[PDB]
Subunit: 127 residues, 4 copies
């Protein structure tokens, strides 16, 4: 049964596993009566989610919208109200911390003295 | 046995699987006699590799350098000559096409008429 | 991009487990629906060659192509009908036959590098 | 960041299969080596709760901590010695017991959405 608490839990559990997006999309479409609150929760949770989890939220929106069309235009219309905000948020958050693995790599190298501090500084500056 | 052809093949097969980097690092360290050509091939192949494959090449360099230290300083020294170039290349390539999934998403939405052209244009502009 | 079996092989070798990668390739395959026969044939050839951890994405791609091809014509539904059961069967067998592969590859790393003594590896190995 | 079992649980829940994620968490655990006992205890508790596809990363993290902890002291080598065999055994059992999970989840999607008739699903299902 649908509950906003059940949704927060499934969104929190939304992983990188290939089945994750489509499995959740099936449950969301079964509960299309609640399309408005679903999108409201999705939007709130997309903003709260970490930089690396955000892009999977848009994949979820894409799968839900595309597959909901054969059932009703409610998901298409509900998502339409938040998508400009959603895309602009993910696009700037993608930019801010795109080199996060590179920054993390140099931090590991510094802390584990993989190279000397001067060489670390050259690598940092090269970014 | 080591061959630059055997290396190109293993680098080409270097995937996202958790074991991929450390498994290849074991073979590269066994063949540390060839550290110079290994790094030369790695560097050439890192540049030829696609944007999404490039970061795994640096993870490979990190694992090789860290683990080679108990055997000899050759990998540390050989990598030192190319790392400023390697990091600067990955850091700009990360930036150029960070929003590649977002750009690809909008292209799917346009082509599959998920939303009308005017709404697609708003989403594009929001990036 | 103009259709060719070589272009398709390169696209399948670069296919990743991401939704945007499956769906971007799916757009190109449906644009080239005139070649559904050769497309399905190459897809199946490349699926069998593919690494155990890459096989599942091929099935996600087939489903995305079939579902989205319907509004364009019956070509892909028809072409995949004859191979999808065998394609799924292959993935079913290979997933069982290569299930222990990540733990075996992990153990291989630990046999070579772990600082715990020899009996520890045997204990891990026995657990499997 | 100051050490706490709650901070560690949050860090483990955000731990990804990427090298930079395993190694960044590993830096923090070795900095907090004074708490090796409680760290290993939480790690093991969180590994068992973790989704089948997330379990393997915990083992990569344990190995990175043990290898890099040595130059700092014997705390982590000592603490992981007593649990790593059981931790590995759990992953060995769960990988076999949940091997067919991705194909089963794929079939679940196709049962709900596929445009091929009912007999097709049964044929896929029989292949497993
Ligand atoms: Cl509710
Ligand atoms: Cl549905
Ligand atoms: Cl050679
Ligand atoms: Cl080694
Ligand atoms: Cl299409
Ligand atoms: Cl450390």
């Amino acid at each position: 049964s649908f509950s906003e608490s059940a949704l927060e839990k499934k969104l929190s559990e939304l992983s990188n596993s290939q089945q994750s997006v489509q499995t959740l999309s099936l449950w969301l479409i079964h509960h299309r009566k609640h399309a408005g609150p679903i999108v409201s929760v999705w939007h709130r949770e997309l903003r709260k989610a970490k930089s690396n989890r955000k892009l999977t939220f848009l994949y979820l929106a894409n799968d839900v919208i595309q597959n909901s069309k054969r059932k009703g235009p409610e998901f298409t219309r509900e998502f339409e109200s938040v998508l400009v905000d959603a895309f602009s948020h993910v696009a700037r958050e993608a930019d801010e911390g795109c080199k996060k693995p590179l920054e993390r790599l140099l931090n590991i190298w510094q802390e584990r003295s993989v190279y000397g501090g001067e060489f670390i500084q050259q690598l940092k500056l090269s970014m």
